[PDB]
Design a protein around this nucleic acid. Structure first.
Ligand SMILES: Nc1ncnc2c1ncn2[C@@H]1O[C@H](COP(=O)(O)OP(=O)(O)O)[C@@H](O)[C@H]1O
Ligand SMILES: Nc1ncnc2c1ncn2[C@@H]1O[C@H](COP(=O)(O)OP(=O)(O)O)[C@@H](O)[C@H]1O
Ligand code: ALF
Ligand code: ALF
Ligand SMILES: [Mg+2]
Ligand SMILES: [Mg+2]
Lengths: 528, 507
DNA sequence: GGGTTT
DNA sequence: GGGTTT
């Protein structure tokens, strides 16, 4: 049930227009975009639509990747000319820029003008085409009353020449869906969007400091800073039943400033001390393949070594398999190894030696048995309780005594598909001019993700959420946090301060220039 | 003056290892200045280490940063790494051997792990298993003021009093009570004192909020306090526009052994020294590098004029003998070679390497400001001769000439030259680097650097307060409410650390 | 303070 | 967010 307004935005995109569309939090911008992408792929070809957002989690929300990863620009810091040369040195990224017909960019408010101009420069040069983005069709989506770009001065995306020359058409949504049960809640949010909080709104938000329902549902929690988020995630993890599994990163290398090293290690995004349990909610923080990327969300199923996981995966791919195969692998692990390995640079092999000494195996420490929940896939004819496989699997797991046990994670994509991944340690490095590492880390590419920074929460729908505004420092940050909620009953707000909720005048000015959904219908009848 | 202040001095004189404390403005640093004199007469002038946690707080008592005194650099490595670094330096090794007393002011911004490392270094160097190798300790400060700064995501800071070194070394604690700085306003003192403990009632909040009114439009340039360097720099550059002079621009010169420009740009972000430094006659500045015994990080001064070294040598000669024979200035004016010969009569490879980078630090004529010719105005052919000598400097760097003032009120006239900063690998290879003047504008201060100052006229903007004790430090700099303006006061952002509350209950 | 990376 | 160095 897309609205008339939402569908008209899809049809304008179908007709080939360069559009920016927008609307308050939870007006269905990303939900419509999911549908739009399906039809753009049929117009341009499945691989010829770049699906992108300003953050990894917001990109995963629509089945896409970071604009940075897609473009091939890294952090995109330098001169446009250097970035273009960096991109064309990557055959994957050069072909992508030559081949795509459409570029979808969600949560665009966090992309600064300098980035937009450089992306435009890169597309024009690669495609040998002086049209606004080398002629790529533009679908820009977001709300500039939400978070602005991180400025580490930055200008908004709509201030760039690339924007003003590329964006042909704008459409504004008005109906709020996320909080549709509660019209008074919507008005509180919409005035907060514009920075205009009155006494009754302040009273109503301050009422929400009461704790959330005590149900067994683990709440989402939103904070301004990573230190708050990490503290809240590790707090929740300690409350989870179960033995903790600790993954201590291996850090190097040669940079002398100890503090600078730690600051740089932070932006590898995986923590120095990763603590995990069965059932922990985790986020992938490295771009590993097409569908396992920075922002992919998952749940820890158990901890297994690769040998145990091979048998488990074989069992989950054929539950009615005769247990004879599993018994051979139990009593003859050399055949498990051969069976497993039948299916599977130089400084690369020197990173594998470092990864070999990661999460070191304790030959003395007893291997806890597999949580019984992992055999539920079988346990949905009296002979057909030949689930002797379960004890066979438990034996094979005990034979992992003195081997490293990695988290098995079920990742869930935005289209609801799932993927089982035994998550291996990864490596991050910053190197000098002779390729010696200045700063390096080996760690699982995971972090706890019940709690989110408000930045990474932007784009999420959170039906049970606690928000602590104590450390908000950006315009729109408080609004993003509170507008994640679905119902007032599923929202707790701590440290609400109306003086720290103020909108950017440039955005107020810009939004008076935008066209309505009714003008969108007029364009469509003009189109056809 | 007070009996309480004198008795702290008497205890130190008697040899005790002392921590002493009290609310902001109780005279801890004023009494420290007299105590330092007494200790120097006991141990020897060079044998009392006078230090503090920040450069500006150190200058307030005629000292230097504890890091600079210790020889440990940034002081983040483990104890054995730092010990080797210190003893590898002969000046710092002799200091650690020779001093009989170590004075540390504003001790609340020093982490416990640093005190443990200094303890280790002192015991090893002096071959002595007593606390800090038998050095007498005088620690001073207020832990309800700012805590130690750490950018470590993984390890939280520990207050100095949590360290084994403190618990074993600090034998004696004294608490001062009478607040002197806000003497004539007893209600302001109560407002500040409960604010120190995180207690602010409705009436006190309304009182602070009333101080949003502007400060009087007298001739006096107010000091201005902000939480962040960005705010500080914006305020300093605003006030720089308020001065009538012509602007003088100093652009930094960057380099390093790195070739990947996106990493070099990622790393240059960290540097204190600006890409661009703007100065005028009369600008208030602060030295940010330790250059010699009395020109250090924290030295405050005022820009007099901008001169090349040839001109300054002439100006310096004139200020050192205003009843000069004018024939010398005419000779120098009409024969700059003789100027240089006289200049150089008074006077490596990697050092000549940067010294050639430094020669490229400037490049079109501009007459001097009439202020620099004060002479003895308490017949004057010397003035326009100096102007002539100046105009010949077309085509060379005209550096800021700065009048620095120490806390003892002694002044010092310095022509300030560029300096270097580098980020290095473990073999001291420079990865990225910057050449720039060791100066920043200093009308506005961060609240961190203000800790320890007394500011009779101050504007405070608390908008970006993020740290326990920060609002309290800012507002307690003021002498009177009449001299204080407060913007963006937030009572929720002022609560004390429970470990500090607990620590002081025991004293 | 906060995203972004073969 | 802030501070500390040749
Ligand atoms: N047309 C619609 N009908 C019913 N529910 C909708 C509709 N559009 C959006 N929603 C729901 O509202 C919520 C917010 O949608 P989303 O696309 O994330 O908002 P936005 O991207 O505008 O912030 C989602 O839970 C979505 O399922
Ligand atoms: N005994 C005293 N008599 C008069 N004024 C004093 C006395 N002690 C301190 N002061 C004044 O109070 C102000 C704060 O002193 P200071 O030592 O800077 O305080 P603290 O170090 O405790 O913050 C200074 O201006 C100082 O001149
Ligand atoms: F605008 Al949204 F989730 F994308 F609130
Ligand atoms: F405690 Al102070 F200036 F040293 F307020
Ligand atoms: Mg969205
Ligand atoms: Mg003091």
């Amino acid at each position: 049930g897309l609205s008339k307004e939402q569908e008209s935005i899809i049809k304008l995109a179908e007709n080939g227009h360069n559009i920016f569309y927008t609307g308050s939090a939870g007006t269905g911008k990303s939900i419509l975009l999911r549908e739009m992408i399906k039809v753009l792929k049929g117009i341009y070809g499945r691989e010829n639509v770049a699906v992108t957002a300003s953050t990894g989690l917001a990109a995963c929300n629509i089945g896409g990747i970071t604009i940075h990863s897609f473009a091939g620009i890294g952090l995109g810091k330098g001169d446009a000319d250097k970035l273009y040369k960096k991109v064309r040195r990557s055959r994957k990224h050069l072909r992508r820029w030559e081949n795509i017909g459409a570029l979808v960019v969600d949560e665009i408010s966090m992309l600064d003008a300098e980035l937009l101009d450089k992306l435009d420069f890169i597309a024009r040069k690669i495609r040998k085409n002086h049209q606004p983005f080398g002629g790529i069709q533009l679908i820009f989506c977001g709300d500039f009353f939400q978070l602005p770009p991180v400025s580490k001065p930055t200008k908004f995306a709509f201030e760039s020449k690339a924007w003003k020359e590329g964006v042909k058409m704008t459409i504004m949504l008005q109906k709020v869906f996320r909080q549709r049960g509660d019209v008074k809640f919507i008005d509180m949010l919409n005035r907060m969007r514009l920075g205009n909080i009155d006494d009754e709104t302040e009273r109503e938000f301050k009422k929400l400091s009461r704790p959330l329902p005590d149900d067994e549902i683990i709440p989402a929690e939103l904070y301004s800073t990573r230190m708050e988020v990490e503290r809240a995630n590790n707090s929740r993890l300690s409350k989870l039943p179960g033995q903790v599994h600790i993954f201590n990163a291996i850090d190097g290398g040669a940079l002398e400033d100890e503090e600078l090293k730690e600051r740089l290690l932070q932006n590898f995004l995986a923590p120095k001390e990763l603590h995990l349990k069965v059932g922990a909610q985790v986020m992938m923080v490295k771009n590993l393949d097409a569908t396992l990327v920075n922002g992919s969300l998952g749940k820890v199923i158990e901890f297994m070594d690769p040998e145990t996981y091979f048998c488990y995966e074989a069992l989950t791919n054929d539950p009615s398999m005769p247990p004879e195969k599993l018994e051979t692998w139990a009593e003859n692990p050399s055949k498990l190894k051969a069976a497993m390995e039948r299916e599977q640079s130089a400084v690369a092999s020197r990173k594998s030696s470092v990864k070999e000494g990661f999460a070191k195996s304790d030959i003395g420490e007893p291997v806890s048995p597999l949580d019984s929940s992992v055999f539920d896939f079988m346990k949905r004819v009296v002979l057909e309780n030949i689930k002797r496989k379960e004890q066979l699997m438990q034996t094979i797991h005990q034979n992992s005594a003195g081997k490293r046990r990695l988290p098995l994670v079920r990742f869930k994509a935005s289209d609801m598909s799932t993927r089982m991944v035994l998550v291996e340690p990864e490596d991050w490095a910053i190197e000098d001019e002779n390729e010696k590492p200045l700063v390096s880390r080996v760690q699982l590419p995971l972090m706890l993700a019940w709690s989110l920074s408000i930045h990474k929460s932007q784009g999420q729908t959170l039906p049970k959420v606690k928000v602590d505004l104590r450390r908000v420092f950006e315009k729109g940050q408080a609004y993003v946090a509170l507008s994640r909620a679905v119902s007032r009953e599923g929202l707790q707000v701590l440290n609400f301060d109306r003086t720290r909720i103020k909108a950017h005048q440039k955005v107020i000015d810009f939004y008076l220039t935008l066209s309505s959904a009714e003008s969108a219908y007029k364009q469509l009848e003009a189109d056809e």
